[PDB]
Design a binder for this molecule. Structure first.
Ligand SMILES: *C(=O)[C@@H](NC(=O)[C@@H](Cc1ccccc1)NC(=O)CCCCCN=[N+]=[N-])[C@@H](C)O
Ligand SMILES: [Cl-]
Ligand SMILES: [Cl-]
Ligand SMILES: [Cl-]
Ligand SMILES: [Cl-]
Ligand SMILES: [Cl-]
Ligand SMILES: [Cl-]
Ligand SMILES: [Cl-]
Ligand SMILES: [Cl-]
Ligand SMILES: [Cl-]
Ligand SMILES: [Cl-]
Ligand SMILES: [Cl-]
Ligand SMILES: [Cl-]
Ligand SMILES: [Cl-]
Ligand SMILES: [Cl-]
Ligand SMILES: [Cl-]
Ligand SMILES: [Cl-]
Ligand SMILES: [Cl-]
Ligand SMILES: [Cl-]
Ligand SMILES: [Cl-]
Ligand SMILES: [Cl-]
Ligand SMILES: [Cl-]
Ligand SMILES: [Cl-]
Ligand SMILES: [Cl-]
Ligand SMILES: [Cl-]
Ligand SMILES: [Cl-]
Ligand SMILES: [Cl-]
Ligand SMILES: [Cl-]
Length: 454
């Protein structure tokens, strides 16, 4: 099944490296196609014939429960666009160990591995990692920072859309994330580009391969295609207080006589500050609780109300013609990545991600807990002590003070809120351009509203 061939493939690659080094083959000799073919064949025969012991990270009872879950409840994905395919990876947040996965609906009917082999755009699930997370890490925004959702066009002249909406006005990062509005994400990434932020440094530390970082739609998964396993590794980094661990299924290969062919080496990397990661956890908690883009919390509360009270955080994504739906879920202990789509890339139904995948993943999470009752954990995500708390205006997301609006030095006061920052000084004083993004026209309209309220 999917586990046998995934494990065999990874074991073969590790045996290939071992045999090449053992036989003292140069990096140069390894470039020779005939020599590579020989060493791949020799690696295969060594596993096939050799009596090696392959130790995996797979929790057999959990992985078996995930297979029974997709057998029993996979039909909940079928939405009247034909048989819907599925991939899921369950990952330990502290180690990057893969405890279990779903390769697809039924290996016997379709062998394609939707957990490790198929690459699709992660759509709006890019936003927390590539846009908001990095902006917070760089001290360019906090939890109650304001972004423009005013209408704006891509560089090709097309309006940036959210279903049938061309946009609204100013909104908090929280509203931007809960709805997954697109314009605020676009302005956030544009701000990173304008400031020359090394985005590629963050994404490559987490093992992402992105060919062009200049794509305006990058935060909406434009110019990005990822496996479920890889993308699960990104959400592992946010959930593990910003510390990446490389995903792995193989922990060790030993000869019969106990000689170590290969052993996984942990190389932890602080990709985001603890402040940034713990701020993002708080925002992604509200994405699921708000139930705007996913019914997941309603589905899970009904199936398993005790498990629904674990500290769930998550994010959804939908490609533009509903070809791909994503739901990424974490507790402090585990991350579960979920993709659905069609092997030939044709459209799912409009609600496939909102309802069907949410319901299926609620069943999958319940099946994992039933197989291993403590595995999700009862720990809460919590703000790191290094987080800076700023009292800011609800209206501007910046500290109270004086601003020049149309000549007249205006005293900006009103309702305040605590904003969480990952810098030293926290939020600055209100400036005229108080938000991420927006045109001179947008700001005229915004300030009109704010002055009216004083
Ligand atoms: C999040 O999921 C948002 N949608 C997307 O991110 C979609 C559509 C989109 C793109 C740019 C600006 C606004 C909306 N992203 C997307 O389709 C990118 C991947 C395209 C790759 C081509 N192959 N395919 N499929 C929701 C909330 O609007
Ligand atoms: Cl399997
Ligand atoms: Cl496979
Ligand atoms: Cl040999
Ligand atoms: Cl086991
Ligand atoms: Cl992968
Ligand atoms: Cl795609
Ligand atoms: Cl524009
Ligand atoms: Cl909201
Ligand atoms: Cl970059
Ligand atoms: Cl990648
Ligand atoms: Cl670039
Ligand atoms: Cl572009
Ligand atoms: Cl591996
Ligand atoms: Cl892997
Ligand atoms: Cl041996
Ligand atoms: Cl830190
Ligand atoms: Cl809730
Ligand atoms: Cl609901
Ligand atoms: Cl979405
Ligand atoms: Cl298909
Ligand atoms: Cl706790
Ligand atoms: Cl907290
Ligand atoms: Cl503080
Ligand atoms: Cl303050
Ligand atoms: Cl600072
Ligand atoms: Cl800006
Ligand atoms: Cl303008």
């Amino acid at each position: 099944d999917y586990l046998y061939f995934t494990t065999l493939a990874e074991a073969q690659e590790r045996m290939y490296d071992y045999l090449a080094q053992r036989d003292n083959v140069s990096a140069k000799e390894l470039k020779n196609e005939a020599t590579q073919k020989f060493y791949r064949d020799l690696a295969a025969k060594e596993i096939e014939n050799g009596g090696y012991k392959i130790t995996t990270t797979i929790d057999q009872k959990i992985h078996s429960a995930m297979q029974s879950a997709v057998a029993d409840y996979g039909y909940l994905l079928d939405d009247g666009t034909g048989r819907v395919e599925v991939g899921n990876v369950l990952m330990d947040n502290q180690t990057g160990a893969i405890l279990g996965f779903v390769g697809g609906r039924n290996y016997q009917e379709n062998q394609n591995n939707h957990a490790f082999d198929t690459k699709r755009s992660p759509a709006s699930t890019t936003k927390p990692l590539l846009a908001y997370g990095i902006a917070i890490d760089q001290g360019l925004m906090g939890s109650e920072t304001i972004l423009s959702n005013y209408p704006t066009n891509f560089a090709n002249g097309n309006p940036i859309m959210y279903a049938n909406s061309k946009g609204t006005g100013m909104m908090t990062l929280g509203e931007a994330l809960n709805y997954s509005w697109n314009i605020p994400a676009y302005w956030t990434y544009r701000m990173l580009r304008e400031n020359g932020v090394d985005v590629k440094g963050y994404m490559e530390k987490m093992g992402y391969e992105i060919p062009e970082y200049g794509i305006e739609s990058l935060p909406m998964g434009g110019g990005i295609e990822v496996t479920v396993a890889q993308h699960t590794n990104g959400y592992q980094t946010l959930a593990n207080n910003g510390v990446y661990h490389q995903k792995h299924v193989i922990s060790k290969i030993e000869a019969a006589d106990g000689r170590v062919v290969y052993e996984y080496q942990d190389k932890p990397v602080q990709v985001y500050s603890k402040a940034t990661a713990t701020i993002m956890q708080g925002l992604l908690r509200e994405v699921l609780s708000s139930r705007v883009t996913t019914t997941f919390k309603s589905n899970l509360t009904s199936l398993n109300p005790t498990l629904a009270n674990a500290d769930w955080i998550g994010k959804t994504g939908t490609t533009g013609q509903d070809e791909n739906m994503w739901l990424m879920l974490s507790t402090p202990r585990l991350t579960l990545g979920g993709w659905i789509g069609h092997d030939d890339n044709h459209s799912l139904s409009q609600q496939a991600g909102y309802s069907n995948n949410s319901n299926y993943m609620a069943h999958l999470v319940n099946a994992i807990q039933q197989a291993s009752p403590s595995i999700w954990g009862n720990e809460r995500f919590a703000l790191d002590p290094s987080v800076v708390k700023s009292e800011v205006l609800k209206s501007t997301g910046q500290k109270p003070g004086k601003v020049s609006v149309e000549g007249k030095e205006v005293e900006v006061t009103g309702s305040t809120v605590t904003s969480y920052w990952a810098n030293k000084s926290g939020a600055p004083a209100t400036s005229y351009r108080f938000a991420i993004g927006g045109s001179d026209a947008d700001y005229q309209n915004a300030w009109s509203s704010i002055v009216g309220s004083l």
